[PDB]
């Protein structure tokens, strides 16, 4: 039945490809040709945030749209006030190879992790007043790429062992394990209703996962190289991916296929970080050619450029109210833009 | 109003405490020199770590070796916990002073794998400013392999027959000229990879080391000194 199983699997792939091509023939680009363009988007470095010794991979905005956390591989996790450029907190790390950081939506905890294969949860609100490590989550067999807080007791981590994992923080055990990627999973984004999360890996594929069901609903392909960054559209029915093939892509969940491609001939370096604005009309992407491009997400035009970093842009974040964009880089500086 | 004045000056003094702590951390960070140990299982890169530990603490997979050469601190990181794919986590080591590359030179079957790994490191976009300190380990096993016969280099490298010793550069580690020609052919393979690309930003520093060799820390010290001198000479001088 080996030939029958292979025939069934090939027929399954052909059937779902035909189902996608029959599901929709129109494009969002031809839908939005009547829509007026955004025009030039001018953003200025409203703040420069200095104090990291080494390069920065990750930042995460707090839900207050004022505080933020940044992780650098000098061994520091620094929590900054963006309005007044004051360093609220500076957490020294046991392992100096941190690659991700997440700030809990309540504001009480922060997370980090990296090549140590461990997610460290640091408690900010302590009676003694100085921050300790609350929990130490071990069990991944690769480096940790991305982590995001569902709430104060649930954490979801993507790792280099091709698996994602939902952990219950207080018991320190893997509640759920999400398997199915063949390459190293690099980024994940939570849905607005926190019931679903997408994850892109180094197999040029993105996967949508149900958090409670524990299995993968849908698989999205189209990229030609490793996917480095993924982010939901604010509605939650779509998401954008950035990958090493110098291309950004917009996929929809219900149509289960790619809606747009954001690329230009002169762009040859990969995308390291992506994010959406609050409306979803502007898609911001960080690149390895040392600057960021703001894209009109509805007609795929380069609306603006955020130059001002002397090295590659590793992280990029937009606030919940959408007021500012924070850009980190390998030149050890963050920049707040409006 | 008054309470927000209290809050903002408390925030400013907390920032000042953080900033003085970070400048102390900056001094400690600049004092040490970070190395990435890289290699394979057949190479004895864990052994050379053991000589610098004389001259498994790390439970996170990644190994840390702190060694002290003439009041200069070296922190060498051996990454072992990860998978075989290394595209993404090798980018964490762009600011490393030097990559330590350890090769088993007696084993000829995996020499081409080591050469390909060296080529990928040398031509990587984020590693093209990092000089490589190349250690050719188990040179005593290289000598017994070539003298006993039955394992010829010519089977794995067909251009060894058309190769001669460059100038008989340092005959004392390998007495017999067959051993010398073998080790210098391997060294020239790695350096013809090195000299093909890289616009003076980084250079290879080959060494011939045994298993029981005890001067590898001094070799790393001298090569790192040359690396920093070449970096300064490239920075503010065209020459």
């Amino acid at each position, epitope marked *: 039945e080996l030939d029958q199983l292979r025939q069934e699997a090939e027929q399954l792939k052909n059937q779902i490809r035909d189902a996608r091509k029959a599901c929709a023939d129109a494009t969002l680009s031809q839908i939005t040709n009547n829509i007026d363009p955004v025009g030039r988007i001018q953003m200025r470095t409203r703040r420069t945030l200095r104090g990291h010794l080494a390069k920065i991979y990750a930042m995460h905005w707090g839900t207050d749209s004022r505080l933020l956390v940044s992780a650098s591989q000098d061994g520091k996790l620094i929590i900054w006030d963006s309005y007044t450029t004051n360093k609220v907190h500076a957490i020294p790390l046991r392992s100096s190879w941190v690659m991700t950081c997440a700030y809990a939506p309540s504001g009480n905890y922060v997370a980090c992790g990296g090549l140590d294969n461990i997610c460290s949860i640091y408690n900010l609100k302590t009676r003694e007043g100085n921050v300790r490590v609350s929990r130490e989550l071990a069990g991944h067999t690769g480096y940790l790429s991305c982590c995001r807080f569902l709430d104060d007791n649930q954490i979801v981590t993507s790792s280099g062992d091709t698996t994602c994992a939902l952990w219950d923080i207080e018991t320190g055990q893997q509640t759920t394990t999400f398997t199915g990627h063949t*390459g190293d999973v690099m980024s994940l984004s939570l849905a607005p209703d926190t019931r679903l999360f997408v994850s892109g890996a*180094c197999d040029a594929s993105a996967k949508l996962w149900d958090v409670r069901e524990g299995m993968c609903r849908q698989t999205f*392909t189209g990229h030609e190289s490793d996917i480095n960054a993924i982010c939901f559209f604010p509605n939650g029915n779509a998401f954008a991916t950035g990958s090493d093939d110098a291309t950004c892509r917009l996929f929809d969940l219900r149509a289960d296929q790619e809606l747009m491609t954001y690329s230009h001939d002169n762009i*040859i370096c990969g995308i390291t970080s992506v994010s959406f604005s609050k409306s979803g009309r502007l898609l911001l992407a960080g690149y390895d050619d040392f600057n960021c491009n703001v894209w009109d997400a509805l007609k795929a035009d380069r609306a603006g450029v955020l130059a001002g970093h002397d090295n590659r842009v590793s992280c990029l974040g937009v606030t919940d109210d959408g007021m500012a964009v924070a850009t980190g880089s390998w030149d050890s500086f963050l920049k707040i833009w409006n | 109003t008054e309470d927000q004045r209290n809050e903002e000056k408390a925030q400013r003094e907390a920032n000042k405490k953080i900033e003085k702590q970070l400048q102390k951390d900056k001094q400690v960070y600049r004092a040490t020199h970070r190395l990435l140990l890289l290699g394979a299982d057949n190479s004895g890169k864990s052994t050379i770590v053991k000589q610098m530990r004389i001259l498994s603490g790390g439970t996170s997979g990644i190994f840390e070796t702190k060694f002290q050469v003439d009041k200069v601190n070296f922190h060498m990181f051996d990454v072992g916990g990860q998978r*075989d794919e290394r595209r993404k986590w090798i980018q964490c080591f762009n600011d490393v002073t030097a990559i330590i590359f350890v090769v088993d030179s007696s084993d000829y079957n995996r020499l081409q794998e080591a050469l390909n790994l060296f080529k*990928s490191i040398w031509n990587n976009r984020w590693l093209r400013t990092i000089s490589v300190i190349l250690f050719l380990n188990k040179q005593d096993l290289l000598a017994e392999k070539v003298l006993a016969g039955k394992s010829k280099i010519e*089977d794995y490298f*067909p251009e060894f027959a058309r190769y001669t010793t460059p100038e008989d550069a340092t005959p004392e580690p390998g007495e017999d000229p067959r051993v010398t020609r073998a080790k210098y052919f391997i060294r020239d393979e790695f350096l013809r990879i090195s000299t093909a690309s890289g616009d003076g930003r980084h250079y290879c520093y080959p060494h011939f080391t045994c298993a029981v060799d005890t001067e590898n820390a001094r070799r790393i010290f001298n090569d790192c000194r040359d690396i920093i001198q070449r970096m300064h000479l490239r920075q503010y001088e065209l020459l």
Partner: nanobody
Amino acid sequence: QVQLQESGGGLVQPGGSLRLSCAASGFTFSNYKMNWVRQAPGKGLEWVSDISQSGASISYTGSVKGRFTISRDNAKNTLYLQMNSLKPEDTAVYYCARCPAPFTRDCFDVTSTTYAYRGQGTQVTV
């Protein structure tokens, strides 16, 4: 979908000649360096040959440069390996491997794990 499909293989008398063809779909062919890798029975994956984006830069392994001839058709999006004078050491499973990022001179293609940009493979017996 990034797909690589190998064709050609099978039994051959020693000293024979085969032409392995790798059809590539789901990516631009011209912008990636291509490799030929093989896995001997009861042995790990070892790299055999590589060819640059244009096809000018070409290199081979210890299996002699004269026996094997790598070539690429960027218009046809396909990768050829011409295998001459087969020896019994050449019995292996042969994979065409795209190396992961475009515009690069560095490639990491011989990982034992599920390296994504590698074909399902073809069997050459001799």
